[PDB]
Write a protein that binds this ligand. Structure first.
Ligand SMILES: OC[C@H]1O[C@H](O[C@H]2O[C@H](CO)[C@@H](O)[C@H](O)[C@H]2O)[C@H](O)[C@@H](O)[C@@H]1O
Ligand SMILES: OC[C@H]1O[C@H](O[C@H]2O[C@H](CO)[C@@H](O)[C@H](O)[C@H]2O)[C@H](O)[C@@H](O)[C@@H]1O
Ligand SMILES: OC[C@H]1O[C@H](O[C@H]2O[C@H](CO)[C@@H](O)[C@H](O)[C@H]2O)[C@H](O)[C@@H](O)[C@@H]1O
Ligand SMILES: OC[C@H]1O[C@H](O[C@H]2O[C@H](CO)[C@@H](O)[C@H](O)[C@H]2O)[C@H](O)[C@@H](O)[C@@H]1O
Ligand SMILES: OC[C@H]1O[C@H](O[C@H]2O[C@H](CO)[C@@H](O)[C@H](O)[C@H]2O)[C@H](O)[C@@H](O)[C@@H]1O
Ligand SMILES: OC[C@H]1O[C@H](O[C@H]2O[C@H](CO)[C@@H](O)[C@H](O)[C@H]2O)[C@H](O)[C@@H](O)[C@@H]1O
Ligand SMILES: OC[C@H]1O[C@H](O[C@H]2O[C@H](CO)[C@@H](O)[C@H](O)[C@H]2O)[C@H](O)[C@@H](O)[C@@H]1O
Ligand SMILES: OC[C@H]1O[C@H](O[C@H]2O[C@H](CO)[C@@H](O)[C@H](O)[C@H]2O)[C@H](O)[C@@H](O)[C@@H]1O
Ligand code: ZN
Ligand code: ZN
Lengths: 459, 71, 72
């Protein structure tokens, strides 16, 4: 019922692609003809010629709606789970089975559309500070990306995830790899989600490192992920599917009210030239459904998803996949390249020419959370070193720069010294385009002056 | 009424006090349940250092208010 | 009493200490069982950085409190 602003706006756009006028046009400036009429936003051939690997969601949505032409919602998510409430002349699964309740054979295929087209990191310092954790410790790291979604104009009806900050939960890089799907992470992130919502930020994706120094003394790294190994592993694909399912995308045009997800998955790793690069992905709605039905697992090989057994808990039908040499239909069992579950996105930073719109002025200078293993603790000393001097000075431009900082804000809020109203005021002083009036109100406020008092004597 | 006292370690202890209570009286009320001698206690409310002479209502410390305790 | 210390390895280890114990003593109690030398340990308690001289009762560290271990 309540869609994101970007979805309401793209819905109103027609997405028509203009075409070159042709020597064959024999109308004047009077109307169009078969040679010069515009392309619809999903034009397969326009996307191939311009190397756009998937059509956008809203280009896909408009394609489905032309093909609908009484109402039937054009979008519905796949469900592969056996119908367990079937009491149709037999006991329910696992005691009985019939054609109404068992899932039919599944055919997996590369998804022609992607929910999000592009990942824009608002400043490259956001990426560099995140990578510092690997530079200092040698451990791979993961964080959750906060931001929002808006229009992307390099592809018809495109959407981009605009990343404003990265938050790292508690993690250790040990015998189980990176561990995101654990209670400790989930309960801390619920708190962060709540506080970053108060900053006008959503949790929009996941980023993690797979970095290995190449031994060349030039900062270069090994290329581990590429077309002849794997892009994301099976286990990472399964994790993206759970994340997407837990970050559902709201859509009027789906019977359930939800359709797939705008949550994006980025990996920082070496490219074929040995440079540290970013690769961005989402998984298909088939992958979401497979993982909801608990049908796949990690396999010996990173590029291969393993297909699970029918049990008394889950029923697994035949599963095929459309492989391209031109295509052909293969049996997906016992394992299949998890590639077919991915969609790929582009990524970038805004050009440095124009004015910035980043919510936060700085992304570094104050310790990020959960970097004790890096010698970065969030202390009353560290906050005093960061803030107290500048706060006493009475320089508003400098005070604005220092508090316009995601992890600084979250840390101050955790101290629970400012009131909820005063916390709103600090937030406004940090992210607002017109922040002066808010910063004044805040600095004269009671909670704020208590905080400056606490730092003063904290020493 | 009831006022909160919050140390720097995050722990928040509740107090039963009157608006007429002296701040010295509130420092005793912290010591008895937390064992902390009043000379080590510096109470802060609203960016001001509280004074043993004044009262809670001199500083407009109403119900469900939160003092901060620094050692 | 029992106090928790949260290390660099993700681990949270329980510790048996008394209110009169020094912080230097607690750093040794971490060293033997977690292998981290007292000079590499920087102990923090809820945003207060501890000192080898004082004791747990000086910092109002009661039972079931949690110290944080930071590298250096
Ligand atoms: O005169 C400019 C008007 O059209 C602009 O958009 C162009 O591209 C659209 C793609 O669908 C077309 O539908 C539209 O007719 C084209 O002109 C834009 O909408 C505005 O600047 C003006 O309405
Ligand atoms: O490693 C950082 C390099 O780029 C910075 O310059 C800009 O980089 C991005 C655009 O590509 C911006 O988003 C970022 O905010 C700018 O700082 C840096 O200044 C360069 O010195 C570095 O080579
Ligand atoms: O890579 C480890 C080094 O990290 C810091 O240096 C980097 O980050 C600074 C602040 O962004 C940059 O000014 C500097 O150019 C980067 O190299 C740290 O200060 C170094 O001591 C570490 O060796
Ligand atoms: O297309 C939806 C909205 O996109 C923009 O707003 C988003 O991106 C901004 C960049 O910082 C954020 O400040 C804002 O919070 C996001 O919602 C656009 O400015 C809006 O007008 C659109 O509604
Ligand atoms: O004790 C098992 C722990 O490992 C889990 O990690 C993942 O990798 C496993 C082996 O490759 C998979 O079987 C499993 O499905 C994955 O989730 C996990 O991190 C831990 O919580 C488990 O205890
Ligand atoms: O980011 C690379 C890691 O991917 C896997 O771990 C994630 O996915 C698992 C389920 O497939 C979750 O249980 C786990 O909590 C996630 O972190 C893999 O198991 C790790 O070894 C990889 O480092
Ligand atoms: O200093 C410019 C920004 O990007 C930097 O990239 C550096 O990464 C390493 C620093 O430890 C070194 O390989 C070398 O200084 C650069 O390649 C730096 O990481 C960032 O902190 C800066 O924002
Ligand atoms: O505004 C047009 C484009 O802006 C970005 O790209 C430019 O700025 C980047 C930051 O240095 C450069 O890396 C890039 O090469 C520039 O062309 C944005 O990333 C693009 O998608 C926009 O089309
Ligand atoms: Zn024509
Ligand atoms: Zn049945």
């Amino acid at each position: 019922i309540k869609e994101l602003a970007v979805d309401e706006e793209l819905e109103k756009e027609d997405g028509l692609i203009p075409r070159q006028k042709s020597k064959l046009c024999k109308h004047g400036d009077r109307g169009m003809c078969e040679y010069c009429s515009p392309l619809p936003p999903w034009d397969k051939e326009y996307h191939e010629k311009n190397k756009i690997k998937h059509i956008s969601f809203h280009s896909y949505l408009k394609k489905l709606n032309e093909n609908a032409n009484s109402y039937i919602s054009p979008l519905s998510e796949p469900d592969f789970r056996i119908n367990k409430r079937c009491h149709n002349g037999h006991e329910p699964w696992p005691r009985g089975i019939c054609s109404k309740c068992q899932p039919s054979a599944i055919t997996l295929q590369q998804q022609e559309f992607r929910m999000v087209d592009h990942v824009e990191f608002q400043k490259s310092e956001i990426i560099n500070e995140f990578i510092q954790a690997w530079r200092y410790t040698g451990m791979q790291r993961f964080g959750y990306m906060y931001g929002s979604y808006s229009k992307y104009d390099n592809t018809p009806l495109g959407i981009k995830a605009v990343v404003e900050a990265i938050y790292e939960p508690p993690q250790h890089d040990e015998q189980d790899g990176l561990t995101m799907d654990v209670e400790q992470v989930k309960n801390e992130m619920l708190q962060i989600d709540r506080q970053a919502q108060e900053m006008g930020l959503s949790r929009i994706g996941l980023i993690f490192t797979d970095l290995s120094d190449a031994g060349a003394g030039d900062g270069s790294v090994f290329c581990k992920r590429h077309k002849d190994s794997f892009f994301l592993s099976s286990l990472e694909v399964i994790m993206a599917a759970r994340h997407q399912t837990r970050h559902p995308n709201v859509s009027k045009y789906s019977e359930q009210g939800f359709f797939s997800s705008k949550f994006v998955t980025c990996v920082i790793s070496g490219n074929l030239e040995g440079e540290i690069d970013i690769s961005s992905y989402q998984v298909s709605t088939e992958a979401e459904a497979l993982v909801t039905a608990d049908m796949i697992s990690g396999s010996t090989f990173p590029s291969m998803a393993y297909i699970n057994d029918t049990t008394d808990e889950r029923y697994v039908p035949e599963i095929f996949y459309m492989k391209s040499n031109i295509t052909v239909k293969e049996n997906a069992k016992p394992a299949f390249p998890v590639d077919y579950l991915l969609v790929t996105l582009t990524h970038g930073f805004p050009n440095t020419d124009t004015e910035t719109n980043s919510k936060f002025v700085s992304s570094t200078g104050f310790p990020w959370s959960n970097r004790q293993a890096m010698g970065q603790s969030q202390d009353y000393q560290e906050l005093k070193k960061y803030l107290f001097n500048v706060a006493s000075s009475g320089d508003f431009n400098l005070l604005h720069e220092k508090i316009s900082n995601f992890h600084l804000l979250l840390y101050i809020n955790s101290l629970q010294i400012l009131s909820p109203d005063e916390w709103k005021l600090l937030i406004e002083s940090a992210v607002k385009n017109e922040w002066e009036e808010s910063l004044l109100k805040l600095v004269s406020s009671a909670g704020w002056q208590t905080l400056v008092m606490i730092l003063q004597e904290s020493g | 009424m009831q006022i909160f006292v919050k140390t720097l370690t995050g722990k928040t202890i509740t107090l039963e006090v009157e608006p007429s209570d002296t701040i010295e009286n509130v420092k005793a009320k912290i010591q008895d349940k937390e064992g902390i001698p009043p000379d080590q206690q510096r109470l802060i409310f609203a960016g001001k250092q509280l004074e043993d002479g004044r009262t809670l209502s001199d500083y407009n410390i109403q119900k469900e208010s939160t003092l901060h305790l620094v050692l």
